Amino acid sequence: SMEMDEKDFAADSWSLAVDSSFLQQHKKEVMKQQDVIYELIQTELHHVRTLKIMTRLFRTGMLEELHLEPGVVQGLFPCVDELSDIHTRFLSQLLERRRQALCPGSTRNFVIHRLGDLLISQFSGPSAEQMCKTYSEFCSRHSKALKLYKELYARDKRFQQFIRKVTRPAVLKRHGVQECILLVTQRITKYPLLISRILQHSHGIEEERQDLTTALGLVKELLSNVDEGIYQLEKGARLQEIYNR
Amino acid sequence: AIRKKLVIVGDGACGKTCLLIVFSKDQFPEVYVPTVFENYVADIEVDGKQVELALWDTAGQEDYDRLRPLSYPDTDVILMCFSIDSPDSLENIPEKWTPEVKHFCPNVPIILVGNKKDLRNDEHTRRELAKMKQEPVKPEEGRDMANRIGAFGYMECSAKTKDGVREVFEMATRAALQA
Numbered sequence: 001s002m003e004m005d006e007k008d009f010a011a012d013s014w015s016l017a018v019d020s021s022f023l024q025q026h027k028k029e030v031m032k033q034q035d036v037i038y039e040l041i042q043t044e045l046h047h048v049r050t051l052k053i054m055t056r057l058f059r060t061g062m063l064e065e066l067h068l069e070p071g072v073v074q075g076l077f078p079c080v081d082e083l084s085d086i087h088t089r090f091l092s093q094l095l096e097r098r099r100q101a102l103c104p105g106s107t108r109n110f111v112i113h114r115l116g117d118l119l120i121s122q123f124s125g126p127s128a129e130q131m132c133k134t135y136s137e138f139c140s141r142h143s144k145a146l147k148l149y150k151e152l153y154a155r156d157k158r159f160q161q162f163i164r165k166v167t168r169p170a171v172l173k174r175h176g177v178q179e180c181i182l183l184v185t186q187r188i189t190k191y192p193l194l195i196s197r198i199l200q201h202s203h204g205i206e207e208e209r210q211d212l213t214t215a216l217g218l219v220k221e222l223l224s225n226v227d228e229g230i231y232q233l234e235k236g237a238r239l240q241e242i243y244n245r
Numbered sequence: 246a247i248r249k250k251l252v253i254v255g256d257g258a259c260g261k262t263c264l265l266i267v268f269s270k271d272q273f274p275e276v277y278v279p280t281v282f283e284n285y286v287a288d289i290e291v292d293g294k295q296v297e298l299a300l301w302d303t304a305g306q307e308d309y310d311r312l313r314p315l316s317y318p319d320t321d322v323i324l325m326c327f328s329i330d331s332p333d334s335l336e337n338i339p340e341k342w343t344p345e346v347k348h349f350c351p352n353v354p355i356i357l358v359g360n361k362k363d364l365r366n367d368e369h370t371r372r373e374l375a376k377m378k379q380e381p382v383k384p385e386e387g388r389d390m391a392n393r394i395g396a397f398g399y400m401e402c403s404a405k406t407k408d409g410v411r412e413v414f415e416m417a418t419r420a421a422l423q424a
């Protein structure tokens with residue numbers, strides 16, 4: 001992540017990110033809603049950072065330093081460029097909504113009142129179709145990526161040394177290859193929990209309550225479609241094993 | 246420091262997310278309790294052995310039967326949670342969660358954990374449950390369920406007061422280290 005966004009989301013909550021004199025101006029219900037919206041954006045920033053570790057540190061590092069057989073790097077990191085484009089675009093929209101909401105003279109005091117419309121846009125139309133297509137492909141290739149990683153780590157000296165080198169820094173403690181893959185697979189199922197809690201504190205404006213109710217329904221339809229479109233791929237599985245599913 | 250993986254399972258109301266949050270911060274959040282848990286790698290020393298224990302939550306995956314099992318590969322220990330204020334969460338352990346964990350995590354130790362033990366003697370909880378002809382889970386009901394499902398052991402904790410939380414994760418680490 002870039003320093004400006006890391007500092008804007010360094011605090012454990014929106015109530016600790018804004019100036020205390022600005023916090024004092026809002027009612028408790030507004031503070032509760034803003035704290036959950038801040039968690040959705042903060043966790044989206046971290047999810048985009050996970051995808052940048054996968055594309056820049058791991059994938060690009062393996063292409064530039066190791067002599068792997070063709071198709072091996074794509075097998076370890078399926079769909080990572082498409083996932084990076086989807087979420088960097090979504091994060092850009094969330095951060096622009098926050099930036100427009102800033103008070104003049106401040107880089108930290110804001111209230112986002114209209115998130116629902118942004119979530120409906122993300123989770124409908126062509127962007128929802130692309131999220132469904134990409135996650136159905138990624139999640140169906142998840143077992144295969146983990147197995148290929150385990151094989152290379154145990155049999156290839158140079159691969160093991162590369163992984164130990166780039167994952168040595170303390171800032172990579174939670175972000176080994178297999179950990180990144182599961183953080184990405186689990187991201188999509190965090191959205192309903194976050195949206196439902198924002199909705200619980202968004203009754204003050206009826207149009208906002210209706211828009212977040214619509215967004216929650218669209219996210220659950222996307223998740224149901226991805227879940228029904230998954231079938232784990234296995235290297236070396238024969239056609240007979242497949243058509244006898 | 247050897248690396249081990251822990252996964253927590255249980256119904257949406259079992260308190261699994263709060264349990265991981267409180268353990269990972271050694272604190273019940275004073276200002277904001279997070280809605281979700283990403284992951285964490287805890288440095289734990291148990292009985293003289295140093296382990297890096299990776300922690301994962303299954304919250305949000307309960308309705309998605311093809312996404313949920315992607316959390317299980319290479320798990321070394323399972324915490325299977327229920328809430329003591331919810332006999333309904335305990336009823337879903339033996340024939341829903343247990344056969345799933347035994348299928349995807351064969352031979353992995355399961356610790357059955359009764360969460361929210363601070364509510365066993367809470368007047369409001371006892372009043373609400375009595376309307377559905379129910380009462381908080383008794384410790385013998387928890388132990389008998391753990392015995393029935395082939396659990397490695399039975400433990401209780403309260404994420405609210407932190408009591409029992411450290412003990413659950415130190416025991417999970419010991420279970421993960423066993424042959």
Ligand SMILES: CNC(=O)c1cn(C)c2ccccc12
Nearest residue numbers: 124125128129132221222225
């Ligand atoms: C055309 N094929 C598709 O899969 C989808 C199209 N829309 C709009 C979706 C929304 C949620 C989930 C899937 C789709």
Ligand SMILES: CNC(=O)c1cn(C)c2ccccc12
Nearest residue numbers: 193196197200278279280281
């Ligand atoms: C009044 N407080 C609440 O409603 C919540 C508190 N946490 C941590 C939640 C997580 C998911 C959904 C709702 C909540």
Ligand SMILES: CNC(=O)c1cn(C)c2ccccc12
Nearest residue numbers: 310311313314344345346348
């Ligand atoms: C989500 N659960 C599955 O996909 C399962 C597939 N088999 C064969 C099972 C056996 C016992 C328990 C669960 C499963």
Ligand SMILES: CNC(=O)c1cn(C)c2ccccc12
Nearest residue numbers: 339388389390391392393394
């Ligand atoms: C249903 N199958 C069983 O084996 C058990 C049932 N109850 C109540 C038990 C208590 C302790 C140990 C085993 C069981």
